């Protein structure tokens, strides 16, 4: 008796734990050695559409180069400092002209090209480091921004609560899908060259994710329903509940072992040379979600209800009052 | 910038010698460092070679070329060797250089058969 599913090939891009493989809201799914010291870094295979980092105590945006050095304002942003020749930011055409001598690379789509490019910055003169930096591509600009800071969140309430006695300062931020991020995509070193066919992007008009049971597409058994004025608001929530590699045990006064837990590598004059190390009860990893979270949403446009779930969907129901969305998808775009 | 790697194929004898050459063609960037990597047939994941002993490397930064010489060849040397350039990348502020992964060679497929 047939156990198979004619939806399987279609829904493979919605098997987010397999195709993406890392956190989405916070991606820190791999470790890499740099000059003898292991650090966390992004490693999801799929692009994250709409995603950026909000800085809390600053007016400086996250695509602004990192700090110390007269240039892009105050405590800096997250991006690579100016090189000669300028390697970040780089536009699509500048990028294509750079790698003109390379057949595979020069012809990549704008997103895998940005990821590959970002992957050419070596960390801390360790020529053989497996450690590669993430990137943000801006589709309005055609600009690829390489990220020097790979951290995505530092903001516990008792040091980071907003402009008022935080204890006052050094770096409060969180990933978000803000409206001014619509044209941005968050790219790990691992963004696959064929994400365009194995990864999610546009939302599905007139479709509801379901489960294939007994030759029929049934509703997701277990959902959590949230109000959301529009699809944008639903995607923001789905993203907010998604796979997360943040040390989802929050820290106090920032220690070195916990700075690295959050994805930091430097203090900007040296590295973060932690000389204790976790050899006890870890497996060197416990905050890798490998893509497990509330990554999917069914948005009902009639009831303005975001129905959010944590099991992979295996078929689609045709329902004209729905839009199917994922944490990875563009927050606004529909097909 | 592309990496011109020769020879593309070497069929050699145990005890003989091999000289792989790599030239950085179309480089606007100065050569800072170099790397070599092999894929032995059997595996396809790429091991970073340790320069030392029978493995002797010459770098000429001036002419942006560089070469491996493997002497007294063994069957364990069989595999596809690839060189890679790493560029110095000055930053428009400090004085210190960033490293920048260069393009890879097309490869050298080496064979070190004995009496076969």
Automatic annotation (TrEMBL), chain A:
Disulfide bonds join 46-199, 114-144, 160-172, 217-315, 234-306. It is found in: Membrane. It is a single-pass type I membrane protein. Keywords: Disulfide bond, Glycoprotein, Membrane, Signal, Transmembrane, Transmembrane helix. GO terms for molecular function: host cell surface binding. GO terms for cellular component: apical complex; membrane; microneme. One of its GO terms (biological process) is symbiont entry into host. Belongs to the apicomplexan parasites AMA1 family. Involved in parasite invasion of erythrocytes. This is Apical membrane antigen 1. It comes from Plasmodium falciparum (isolate 3D7). The lineage of its organism: Eukaryota, Sar, Alveolata, Apicomplexa, Aconoidasida.
TrEMBL record, chain B:
CDD domains: IgV. Residues 1-85 form the Ig-like domain. It comes from the Eukaryota. PROSITE patterns: IG_LIKE (PS50835). InterPro entries: Ig-like_dom, Ig-like_dom_sf, Ig-like_fold, Ig_sub, Ig_V-set. Keywords: Receptor. Disulfide bonds join 22-83. SUPFAM superfamilies: Immunoglobulin. This is New antigen receptor variable domain. It comes from Orectolobus maculatus. The lineage of its organism: Eukaryota, Metazoa, Chordata, Craniata, Vertebrata.
